[PDB]
Amino acid sequence: QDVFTTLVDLKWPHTLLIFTMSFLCSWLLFAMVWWLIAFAHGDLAPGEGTNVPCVT
Amino acid sequence: MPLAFCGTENHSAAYRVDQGVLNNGCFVDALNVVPHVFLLFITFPILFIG
Ligand SMILES: CCCCCCCCCCCCCCCCCC(=O)OC[C@H](COP(=O)(O)OC[C@H](N)C(=O)O)OC(=O)CCCCCCCCCCCCCCCCC
Numbered sequence A: 001q002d003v004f005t006t007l008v009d010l011k012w013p014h015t016l017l018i019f020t021m022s023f024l025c026s027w028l029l030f031a032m033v034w035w036l037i038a039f040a041h042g043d044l045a046p047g048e049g050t051n052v053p054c055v056t
Numbered sequence B: 001m002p003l004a005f006c007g008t009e010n011h012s013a014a015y016r017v018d019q020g021v022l023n024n025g026c027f028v029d030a031l032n033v034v035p036h037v038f039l040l041f042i043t044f045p046i047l048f049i050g
């Protein structure tokens, strides 16, 4: 429950792993979101851009 | 010939989403990957603290 006290108590090499994981997971969690949104929108299809892509 | 999540065959026509997205045999497969990456990325920071 004392997460922010625990994070400080951890050694620096552990902090680097948590620093890395907390950001890599956040980048990759939303990577699946952007990939899926563009999948559902239908601009992922490798074809002529008749529509306007959801995220270019 | 890169790595394609859906079928790369038939000129990569498996990403078309006509007749509803849920009828895309690959998109439903994609929908089943999000519940796992959600937990894989929610608990990894929690477990690594422990
Ligand atoms: C039973 C066995 C248990 C073993 C537990 C230990 C596990 C260790 C894993 C070994 C690999 C770690 C590599 C870390 C490299 C940087 C750290 C380094 O060189 O040490 C420098 C120190 C860490 O030393 P310490 O004595 O452990 O410090 C504890 C601290 N005095 C404390 O107790 O409080 O750190 C500092 O002084 C902090 C300065 C940080 C600035 C450097 C920036 C780097 C950022 C991250 C870069 C890498 C990114 C990689 C991304 C990959 C993505 C795919």
Ligand SMILES: CCCCCCCCCCC(=O)O[C@H](COC(=O)CCCCC)COP(=O)(O)OCCN
Pocket (backbone or CB within 6 Å): A033, A036, A037, A040, B019, B020, B021, B022
């Ligand atoms: C939160 C972060 C973002 C998440 C990613 C974006 C999600 C896009 C997928 C939309 C979807 O899940 O698909 C819709 C149908 O979903 C449902 O009825 C809900 C049940 C299925 C979901 C559990 C589209 O329906 P449709 O009528 O075939 O739409 C196109 C044809 N008119």
Ligand SMILES: *[C@@H]1O[C@H](CO)[C@@H](O[C@@H]2O[C@H](CO)[C@@H](O)[C@H](O)[C@H]2NC(C)=O)[C@H](O)[C@H]1NC(C)=O
Pocket (backbone or CB within 6 Å): B010, B013
């Ligand atoms: C592959 O995509 C194309 C276009 O959507 C289609 O392929 C042809 O579709 C016509 C429909 O009139 C058929 O007569 C041809 O025999 C199809 N050829 C091939 C090689 O498929 C079809 O929608 C898709 N086909 C497959 C097998 O995925």
